[PDB]
Curated annotation (Swiss-Prot):
Residues exposed to the Extracellular side: 1-168
Bridged cysteine pairs (disulfide): 26-65, 104-148
Tissue and organ expression note: Expressed in eosinophils.
Subunit-structure text: Tetramer of an alpha chain, a beta chain, and two disulfide linked gamma chains. Interacts with IGHE (via CH3 region).
Chief site of localization: membrane
Portion of the parent chain present: 26 to 196 of 257
Residue stretches making up the Ig-like domain: 5-82, 83-165
Presence of the UniProt keyword Endoplasmic reticulum in the record: no
Lipid bilayer topology: Single-pass type I membrane protein
Residues bearing carbohydrate: 21, 39, 47, 71, 132, 137, 163
Keywords linked to the UniProt accession: Cell membrane, Disulfide bond, Glycoprotein, IgE-binding protein, Immunoglobulin domain, Membrane, Receptor, Repeat, Signal, Transmembrane, Transmembrane helix
Example GO molecular function: high-affinity IgE receptor activity
Lineage per the UniProt record: Eukaryota, Metazoa, Chordata, Craniata, Vertebrata
UniProt protein name: High affinity immunoglobulin epsilon receptor subunit alpha
Membrane among keywords: yes
């Protein structure tokens, strides 16, 4: 009885804007029939990878993938947004000691400057930043709510806060 399958998204963002694409893939079970469940309803998709093109809020929700008589995977919650700024996260629940990366993602990959992430109101400093993202080794301290800010065109926006937990 091979252990249970696992879903991975490419990109890793489980929070995406309306109109973006994301691919879901069911994990490695053997070297060597797929069944996708969207919000718990068997999908007409049977291939190993589920492609979500031009995301629609309707695509938000839970997802599971299962091989025949091998118990289903752990649920993955996707969520489509519509806003100027969106704080994307590698994962919302991180196992202490693992990597945590964030991303102040602008709509249509718009140029955002003066970016600044914050953990519980306070700015986070010294994360490995790169216009693309910021990373850090997970700590039980890193737990808390996040949200970034940045200037677009000439204005300063702020994203919807986000709740991240580092299970010690
Ligand atoms: C699987 O199950 C999940 C639940 O976990 C469902 O997810 C919900 O899906 C609905 C849409 O079906 C989402 O609600 C929609 O929100 C839109 C925008 O949200 C508001 O907030 C943002 C952020 O502040 C604003 O940008 C935005 O303007 C809104 O203020 C609404 O626009 C939608 O209704 C309106 O727009 C649509 C399309 O334009 C019109 O058709 C409507 O008439 C109306 O004018 C809608 O309310 C909800 O947020 C989702 N929940 C979560 C947590 O993501 C999945 O949809 C479901 N999928 C299936 C197939 O079962
Ligand atoms: C991420 O951090 C963990 C734990 O780091 C500890 O706390 C830091 C502040 C610093 O004081 C470190 O020296 C501490 O060890 C790293 O540790 C690994 O943790 C796993 C279990 O959690 C353990 O089995 C490994 O043996 C640990 N390895 C080491 C070198 O201690 C973890 O490796 C770090 N990951 C990266 C790449 O940063
Ligand atoms: C999401 O992926 C789709 C393809 O799956 C992209 O849509 C293509 O867009 C080009 C022009 O931009 C068209 O010529 C193609 O016909 C489209 N493909 C399909 C299958 O319709 C889309 O651009 C991607 N969106 C993002 C945000 O990258
Ligand atoms: C994000 O995390 C914060 C803090 O961990 C949560 O807010 C706290 O909620 C408790 C009650 O559950 C309040 O007594 C505290 O005052 C709140 N703290 C702050 C700083 O506001 C919040 O619930 C989490 N967000 C979500 C959606 O779970």
């Amino acid at each position: 009885v091979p252990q249970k399958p696992k879903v991975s998204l490419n990109p890793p963002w489980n929070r995406i804007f309306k109109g973006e694409n994301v691919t879901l893939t069911c994990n490695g079970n053997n070297f060597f029939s797929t069944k996708w469940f969207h919000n718990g309803s068997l999908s007409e998709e049977t291939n190993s990878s589920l492609n979500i093109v031009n995301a629609k809020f309707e695509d938000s929700g839970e997802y599971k993938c299962q091989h025949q008589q091998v118990n289903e995977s752990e649920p993955v919650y996707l969520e489509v947004f519509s806003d100027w700024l969106l704080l994307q996260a590698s994962a919302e629940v991180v196992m202490e000691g693992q990597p945590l990366f964030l991303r102040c993602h602008g709509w249509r990959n718009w140029d955002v400057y003066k970016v600044i992430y914050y953990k519980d109101g306070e700015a986070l400093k010294y994360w490995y930043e790169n216009h693309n993202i910021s990373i850090t080794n997970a700590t039980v301290e890193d737990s808390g709510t996040y949200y970034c800010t940045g200037k677009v065109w000439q204005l300063d926006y702020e994203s919807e806060p986000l709740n991240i937990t580092v299970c010690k």
